[PDB]
Design a protein around this ligand. Sequence first.
Ligand code: QEN
Ligand code: QEN
Length: 90
Amino acid sequence: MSLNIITVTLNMEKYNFLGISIVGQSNEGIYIGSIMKGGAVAADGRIEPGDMLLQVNEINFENMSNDDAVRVLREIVHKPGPITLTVAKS
Ligand SMILES: O=C(O)c1cc(Br)ccc1NS(=O)(=O)c1ccc2ccccc2c1
Ligand SMILES: O=C(O)c1cc(Br)ccc1NS(=O)(=O)c1ccc2ccccc2c1
């Protein structure tokens, strides 16, 4: 079996939102659920639904409830500067 890791840096200059929902928990992993067409993640085009979310900026997502993962993504999107996502491809 093959594992494909990609790291995606979004400058968030032309987009306010990532435009993602997330599914699953890692305090029992967390995956990209929906991607909305108008957001930074869709514009970049590399991340797809079912990709596993490993890290966003300095936060690891591998010991979190779904609710806490949504909370930390809210905090990151409301902070200035680029957003770096590391995912494992489905
Ligand atoms: O993120 C943006 O800059 C954006 C701008 C426009 Br115009 C439209 C959508 C955008 N982002 S999006 O991730 O697709 C998005 C974000 C929140 C939404 C809330 C309600 C309905 C659609 C939404 C789309
Ligand atoms: O920007 C995002 O796509 C986003 C995704 C998650 Br999961 C959590 C927070 C996110 N950013 S956010 O600016 O706080 C936000 C808040 C409310 C939203 C409501 C509908 C659609 C997108 C939203 C994004």
